[PDB]
């Protein structure tokens, strides 16, 4: 039913526009999603036509633009780009963006997204244009904002396209970063987070990425902006630890201590706390996992602002996010005087047992009795976790005999319709089997069968 609807549409358009052209697009679109590659046809009599419908200052009632666009968005990527560029020359785009037609804009936006060399228009102004429409506080049409954003994220892979961003627009970016206007500002922040992934050490101007200690304090006046930034940084530190970009740490290491203070100082800056408390803890949990020497930076933020331990209201919170290693060393007394095996602490247990050393501090709170007390649903969650590490498994497989069984036979483990319990239980077996028959002493037989019975049904 591919080439069938292919021409069924192209022709219904050259007519007087039947009152079902909206339905024809609706379904013919899903057929495209299935079949990956396209036949050996020419996409000129179609795209060169739809372009006429979108560029036409005249609209039609019997035509749901939303669908018509969904078709184009799923056609440009399939067919070769050389043929696409023939319908949309490098100059056509420039006009499509400067036109007063939103539906037309979103079109070229995705045509640029699938530009053959990710550094083709790298020497054009089309890139600066999109950036101009993106940070244009006026533009409310979402379908466009995203279309452009997703278009940049795909081209920002090339080295050239990035230059046209942080070299041919460096002044404009710093500009928007200066106006700091809710709408416009926020759009730049989410953008930066995306670019920091395809950026190297040299091509990195801390004049658009890093924020002055002042800027942060000046955003607190518009919480929406403050929160959006705390998350930006939280992700920034995240991206660093995973992609081993320990070079950036030197930059975003001066402002981190600023957040810690804003968090503590509730008298002045009351908003910050009870208006972004959680999103902040998310950052402190990332700072504790920063690649530094003897946890220098964090060791101070804790001793100065985030006085972990002092506030009980947060004790649980802390032991659920803050690095387990740092906790078992500079706050061992805490992880030792509060973590109690329960469906409630099911959270802490996951983060705390992340470090063999840390675990060996809570392992004294564990006991088959306390575990089998709580309902099955929570048991699987606790068990499954104790099987996410080797040092924890050994424990569950020995010191905890009874529990191990409460995981396999019961008479009809299939009587478990609870999707959640099934998830954890079935998982607690998957990683528990990777232990190998050697280690899994006498539980191998029951496991390989209980898991097999679950994998099938």
């Amino acid at each position: 039913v591919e080439n069938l609807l292919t021409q069924l549409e192209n022709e219904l358009n050259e007519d007087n526009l039947p009152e079902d052209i909206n339905t024809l697009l609706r379904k013919c679109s899903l057929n495209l999603v299935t079949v990956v590659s396209l036949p050996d046809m020419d996409v000129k009599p179609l795209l060169a036509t739809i372009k006429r419908f979108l560029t036409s200052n005249v609209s039609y009632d019997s035509l749901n633009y939303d669908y018509l666009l969904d078709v184009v968005d799923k056609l440009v990527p399939m067919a070769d780009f050389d043929d696409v560029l023939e319908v949309y020359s490098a100059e056509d785009l420039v006009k499509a963006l400067r036109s007063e037609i939103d539906p037309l804009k979103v079109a070229a936006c995705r045509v640029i997204e699938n530009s053959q060399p990710k550094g083709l228009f790298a020497t054009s102004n089309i890139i600066d244009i999109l950036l101009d429409i993106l940070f244009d506080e006026k533009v409310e049409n979402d379908k466009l904002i995203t279309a452009i954003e997703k278009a940049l994220e795909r081209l920002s892979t090339d080295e050239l396209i990035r230059r046209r961003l942080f070299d041919n627009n460096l002044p404009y970016l710093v500009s928007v970063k200066g106006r700091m206007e809710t709408v416009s500002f926020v759009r730049l922040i989410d953008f930066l987070t995306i670019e920091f992934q395809f950026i190297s050490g040299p091509e990195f101007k801390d004049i658009i990425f890093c924020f002055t200690k002042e800027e942060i304090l000046k955003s607190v006046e518009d919480i929406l902006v403050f929160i959006e930034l705390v998350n930006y940084y939280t992700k920034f530190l995240l991206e660093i630890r995973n992609q081993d970009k320990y070079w950036a740490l030197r930059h975003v290491k001066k402002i981190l201590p600023v957040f810690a203070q804003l968090f503590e100082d509730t008298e002045n800056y009351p908003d910050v706390r009870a208006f972004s408390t959680n999103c902040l803890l998310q950052l402190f949990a990332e700072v504790s996992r920063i690649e530094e020497d003897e946890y220098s930076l964090f060791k101070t933020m804790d001793k100065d602002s985030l006085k972990i331990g002092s506030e009980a209201k947060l004790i649980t919170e802390w032991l659920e996010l803050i690095n387990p290693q740092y906790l078992v060393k500079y706050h061992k007394d805490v992880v030792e005087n509060y973590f109690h095996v329960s469906g409630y602490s099911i959270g802490m247990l996951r983060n705390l047992s992340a470090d063999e050393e840390c675990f060996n501090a809570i392992r004294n709170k564990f006991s088959a009795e306390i575990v089998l007390r709580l309902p099955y649903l929570e048991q699987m969650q606790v068990v499954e976790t104790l099987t996410r590490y080797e040092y924890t498994s050994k424990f569950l497989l020995n010191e905890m005999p009874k529990v191990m069984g409460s995981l396999i036979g019961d008479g009809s483990a299939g009587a478990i319709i609870d999707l959640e319990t099934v998830h954890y239980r079935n998982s607690a077996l998957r990683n528990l089997l990777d232990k190998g028959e050697e280690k899994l002493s006498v539980w191998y037989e029951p496991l390989l069968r209980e898991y097999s019975k679950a994998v099938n049904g």
Binding site: K143, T182, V186, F275, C279, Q282
Partner: protein, 73 residues
Amino acid sequence: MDLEGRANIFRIHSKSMSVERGIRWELISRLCPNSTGAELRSVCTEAGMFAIRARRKVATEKDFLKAVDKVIS
């Protein structure tokens, strides 16, 4: 769903509760990307609670942030 459907979900699930005009959904949503379609809903219901928790009978944009931070953490 990331083509800013999160924005729509809000707009739609909102016109069934007491909420003042304005409330830039485009931004409120940019604070919940990985939020599976269902998550958006859990925020709205909570948002209204803060408005009640206080006094107002209508939810303001700030009540949503007070919820998103309490939901998506």
